[PDB]
Symmetry: D2
């Protein structure tokens, strides 16, 4: 249990800020602020993590979702990050993400962006 | 607001069952049972959806996460589905997913599976 | 060797047409015409396939790339399909794809679309 | 035309080596040696790139495929990299990839890995 290791404030390579609390049971709850795209201020996030990971030096699997609607803007889209927490002096959360926009059925083929974010405790 | 359209029981092409409640504010809460893989019985899910989608015939963006730990099994992994809800006589949730396993850093390159699920209200 | 099974004309769910020749050694060579997006007429494709697949009922792994430049249009982008050929009465090529556009570094995070195409010998 | 910029020997973060020749018309031809996985020695690659990219500081879209069969090993799989070439003092090819294995239809849901490689001219 990396409840303590995961809970807190994280930053990715784009300058985004992820603030999360990890629950004893597996819950992730917090806010996300993107440095890029059709986004301003904080958005609600929720997710899950493996509260009893392997002890053989493997990372801790986790994911979370942001729907890009808040009181300021609605980008009609949602991103999910799937990845793993790796603890130790330079802790990191290494993720891949899928960002789907609402589209018509004719445009569904171009609905989803894919990328990768690395979160650290500094920067 | 597709709160009413999304809330309920869904089935995908693999025979999996997703039971979800959509909150007025954007919350998704429920359980997921996979017909395949290292999984048995129900797992907690949480996510988010766009509670005020475009009215121009576009779908409703949403996502959710399952960490594959419950009282029966721990597969040290998490899947996130990112996609869109499309309403109407044959309602569907069309998704793409990322399934990350906890790994050592040497094996991180083979940590993440990707696929696509289509959920319907029947089958 | 599915050289014979793969060589020919394929159609996907979007109405696109893939014409391919499979070489004895693993080569794929042909043309692709997309029914959607910033594309008109035929584009060059090249790829590779497993010329000696498992005989245990598994599919045949393959991939290919199109750069979306031809004599009519340049969409400054390239798609790669990765997937498998499955033979038998209803032969199919089941793929997932990545479509990267050229972008500035500031916009690289939104450079890549992801989707899934299923190709059949009819429609 | 980054024919000259792309042609040559590249290295990724895993210690893999990509040797490529870019043709005037858009062709990519070469060999790939993976530092990881079920692979030994060199494998054939083929792909495509945008031979007339935008001049507004955007990268050059490209992709390529390796089928993991050579005279030493057959891993019944293929990877496609989709990405962009960025020129200048620290040139890079930034990619995302899809690695599909041949599987039975029952196991198709776990056929495809996804990741990201960054290639540079040194290391």
């Amino acid at each position: 249990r990396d409840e303590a290791g995961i809970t807190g404030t994280w930053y990715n390579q784009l300058g985004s800020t992820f603030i999360v609390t990890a629950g004893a049971d597996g819950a992730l709850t917090g806010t996300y602020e993107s440095a890029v795209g059709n986004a301003e201020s904080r958005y609600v996030l929720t997710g899950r993590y493996d509260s009893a990971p392997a002890t053989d030096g493997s990372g801790t699997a986790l994911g979370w979702t942001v729907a890009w609607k808040n009181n300021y803007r609605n980008a009609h889209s949602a991103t999910t990050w799937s990845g793993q927490y790796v603890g130790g002096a330079e802790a990191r959360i290494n993720t891949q993400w899928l960002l789907t926009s609402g589209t018509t059925e004719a445009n569904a083929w171009k609905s989803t962006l894919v990328g990768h974010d690395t979160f650290t405790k500094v920067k």
